[PDB]
Amino acid sequence: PITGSMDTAYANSTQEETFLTSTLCLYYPTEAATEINDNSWKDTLSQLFLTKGWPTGSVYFKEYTDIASFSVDPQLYCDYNVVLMKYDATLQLDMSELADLILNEWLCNPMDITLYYYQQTDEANKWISMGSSCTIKVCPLNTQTLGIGCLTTDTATFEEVATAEKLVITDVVDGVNHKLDVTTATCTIRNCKKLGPRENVAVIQVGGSDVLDITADPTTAPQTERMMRINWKKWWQVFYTVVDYVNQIIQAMSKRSRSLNSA
Amino acid sequence: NYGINLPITGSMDTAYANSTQEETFLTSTLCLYYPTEAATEINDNSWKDTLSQLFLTKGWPTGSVYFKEYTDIASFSVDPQLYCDYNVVLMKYDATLQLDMSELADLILNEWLCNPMDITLYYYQQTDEANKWISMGSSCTIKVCPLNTQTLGIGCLTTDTATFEEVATAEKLVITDVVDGVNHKLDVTTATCTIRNCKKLGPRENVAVIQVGGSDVLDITADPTTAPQTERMMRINWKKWWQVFYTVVDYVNQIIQAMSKRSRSLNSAAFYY
Amino acid sequence: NYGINLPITGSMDTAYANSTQEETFLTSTLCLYYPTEAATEINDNSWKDTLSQLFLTKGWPTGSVYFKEYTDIASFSVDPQLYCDYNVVLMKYDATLQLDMSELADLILNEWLCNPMDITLYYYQQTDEANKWISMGSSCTIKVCPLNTQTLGIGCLTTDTATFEEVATAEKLVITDVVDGVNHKLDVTTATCTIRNCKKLGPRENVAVIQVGGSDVLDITADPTTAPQTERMMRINWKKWWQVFYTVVDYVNQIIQAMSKRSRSLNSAAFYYR
Amino acid sequence: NSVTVRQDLERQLGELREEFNALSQEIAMSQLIDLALLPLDMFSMFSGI
Amino acid sequence: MASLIYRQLLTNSYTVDLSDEIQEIGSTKEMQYNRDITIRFKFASSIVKSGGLGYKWSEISFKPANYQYTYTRDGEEVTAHTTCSVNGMNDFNFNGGSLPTDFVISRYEVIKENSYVYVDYWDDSQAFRNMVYVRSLAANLNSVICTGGDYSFALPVGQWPVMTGGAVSLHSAGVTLSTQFTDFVSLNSLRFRFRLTVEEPSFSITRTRVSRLYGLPAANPNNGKEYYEVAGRFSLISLGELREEFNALSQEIAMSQLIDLALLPLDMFSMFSGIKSTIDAAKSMATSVMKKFKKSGLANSVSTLTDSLSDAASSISRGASIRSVGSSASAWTDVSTQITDVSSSVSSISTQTSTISRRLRLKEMATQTEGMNFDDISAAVLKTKIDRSTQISPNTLPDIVTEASEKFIPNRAYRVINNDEVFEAGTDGRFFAYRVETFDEIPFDVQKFADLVTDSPVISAIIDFKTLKNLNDNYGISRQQAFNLLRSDPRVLREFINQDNPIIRNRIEQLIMQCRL
Amino acid sequence: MASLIYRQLLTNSYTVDLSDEIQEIGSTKTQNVTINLGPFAQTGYAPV
């Protein structure tokens, strides 16, 4: 707890500590860079970034070539991550599942599909699986370890809830045990508890009429500051804007407190 | 009722009779509406059953829930006689059918009062932002002809319907809107259509249109000025249909709480006069 | 305040307010239901019209009265979409169809609340003297099988419907009653029938089943103990159909007064339902 | 001659609670106290239910 | 405190039986180690035909079956042996008629939901061989479906009936202990038992009247499979002479810390908490500890007094002549007053007092009294040492506890106040008379004693005269205190021993040294 | 005194079951003698 005494003593600035001490990592798709067609675009933008106040060695440019691969590999490298996403209408959800992961703070443990049938506990316990080809079939158990609409013995009676995805956040009726059948060969499924959000990413969405759901329920719809949208023209324009408004975008995020044991 | 006159007491006793979900679990019914494609993708002869046992978890006794199959937004729109206390209808945006969907939402999500119209004998008039003409059937094709204060056409001859103005070409559900305070000779294809004069109002303390797909927005306002967003208008992110239902079950109460029973004493709410 | 919360305090102001019939003449609609035979015997292309002018006498404006033709008690007993504010239905005494008639009366004369039943997936049970199963359609054939507290048959095998107990063989309207508080696997012929679970509530402040012929009955109690006789259950002595209608017209108000406002539909509602 | 035993899902921990609470808001006062001067032991508790 | 624990036991002995009766029906006629596990097994059948023409079968039954195999686990090849048997099988039959030419199956076994399948398992790794003390074990195994294959009944003439179908799924249920004895050595194992659920398809016998039955028949339960398999994981959590040590171990018990732990109802659940055992020891052992009590000193004795009342209140018409030092007959006083069944050496009084002590004393306790009751000093001794030992094993806990009762605080006396008069039955020897206040001695009486003992509350004189009079002089002892130091009040006593430390700390301690057993 | 003994009993009745449940697993065998059993119709021989 902090003492609550109010007497105004504005810090003045904020942005002058972040310019000096933090890193900015820009994630874009291949198509983005291909359209730019220059061997020095990363460089040109970097000099332009000095204008907005980021020292030479400060900004990094990471290339995801698809929303599916990026969704697997979000080993976010820098202090501030602003990821550019391209409105692909068939991939929407893939995009939703990826946003749900970056924009939020996650806690996971490993699951052994082989030996122990599991259950989610609250609106915050979800099963996040990801890999080459993720195919998850489920079988709900009554209080006897017996199937309900399935035979815990033949997976041909299971209920398929994911057919070969690259990132999947599965949700089952809370408080019910399930024998799980993932294709662990190409997939990895882990039991995650949600929570803290991310004081970094800033998914900037290119194109559409971009409104999309990021809750698992139907009741809520959360709209955060770390969820921005830009009107597509050309990719060079997108980057110019991202640079021309770096601080504005950074200010909508700002350095993490998670005491995250994974690091 | 018999009572409305003579106000309640506003004293803030401040007690809140705990719960409310424990009365609805015992006494109410839940009706799930989905499209055929939804069930076809599930491919089990016992899906309705499995989900039902799962529904006991969330607190709904065996004989409580149900499952009604609309096979299209167009058919579901016309002979909708909401069967249960609480109705939660699953709609998976189809982009060409948007207005079909809008017209259907406008009907379920709202409280409607209608009277019958005789297109043959009488020349009538829409009164306020709440008087609309809701017609529905096999193939609804409505042509209109505005009348000046003489019973004469304005851009049309009340005699030849080839001069009328077509405002609906073979729809399954149509909520027509004309310039308020003007009489119109109407020409519907009554053979396959039925057109009735409805006054709007009360909303629905039941449905909960849950939208699957796209980047969904609905515009109940026939106008341009308003856009109403209600709690009984929810949205879910499409993965697989089994997942959709799991979520609907895992959050039944949350969905029910966004509605609230007590408003359902009619088979169909096409209120008749 | 709408919330169907109630209070009212009865001071005897004694302002006995006058007429009542002069609001109903202006604002309400009267729907006459008769059988085909009724109209056929009348043999005029303008009978509906003549009676209508005669209805102005009793005080009902031209566009006020409607004439609906049921051709049988079984079909009429079907969808029941009573069209007008006040419905007075004429029933001709057919002695073999008595129960058909009783089941139809029980439906119009009373206020019903129903939910749908899935005979396929869930074996049901009735709860009180007011929970009944009202099924109706082309051909309604209902066979039942009582379950003990194990989901096992009692005098039947929940597996072969040849052991079930038949309680309705092809009716057009059926109000089935089973021993309260017992589960039953049901076997209806859903192809031609629809069976729904209804709870009996209020009565009807409209119909007025007027019975032609016999000496009469039609008891709407499922039990043996009670016999209710209501005002909305009238009887006329048959002579000729023209005479019946003349009387119905000559005593419209008297008949309407025995009904009045259909309270469950009254605007003024809410938590009670419409 | 039934093949497989019936399987009936039960109410979840979190569930049940939300009702207990509300159900408490009504308990009388005096009537309660007393029933705390009566050795409600074993045989007693599992009598009803 | 001890009051409960002790009495609590003799109260719950009736149980001893029920339990006892179980193990018979069921009786015949640290360090952790892990390992996924793969259980492969199979059934066997015995099919016996009746004699005669050859159309009749007499028996189709399950028989235990062995299987051996090798599998990999953690880079090591594990060799395993299993034996599969069933229990609770159901007898079915088929009667095609009594003619020599009619097909009949007199008895065929079927396993259903009231049956169990047991699979005994052994493998050749080292963790398994080191399992001889087991504090705990759980298995997480996949289920397996066992389905029946076809079995043709080759009749001498015509078309052959064929049994086909049947199925059950196996579910891990309950984990125990077990061991296989063959021609020479043993194979330790904690065989799990599988509960069964019937599954599709049902079974039938073609050409007959047997169809749509659920369960697995014994005709061809392996359905041509070389074996059935259940795999998963299991977790294990693992860990005369006696007396001579208890004594020495006592010489250290503190003082104040002890007393207190004699103002805490150390009942049942408490005592057998600390013990850490392999299996249902402390359990049937808290029951065995019982099955020892109801067969010892404290037992019978208490069982005697009880009767000696009934019998003397039931008799009366023929009340035992006996004799009574006091108003009138009353087991307590009199029955001891007379059955001075032992003999020779000193003075009158002492002998009765004594024999009236025996009953009065120890005995009293297991019923009603105030302040720290001797035993509550004893219990304290027990719950103490029986913890500073650590042991597990069954054959110990019982007896030793019991024996503690019979031989703790060899002697000890009591007192009864009434009108400021401390009457002290110094068991074995002695007896004094007070004037409550000014600690004084006047002629004691076998009489005044008689009654005032019989029906009033007694007191387990913690500290007695000797210590008291010596205490009263070299100190002070407010009238207030004193009055408590008699009722053997916890507080006031705890004070001194905790505070002051003179004498008091011997009268106490000495007692500890006495509950040496 | 009696206070206990009496009450003591109703207190320890829960046991009745456990024990009760023993002697069963232990007594003889149980037998399902309800094989449903169906009733009448009358049909017969028809040739000359």
TrEMBL record, chain F:
This is Outer capsid protein VP8*. It is found in: Virion. It comes from Rotavirus A (strain RVA/Monkey/United States/RRV/1975/G3P5B[3]). The chain holds residues 1 to 48 of 776 of the full protein.
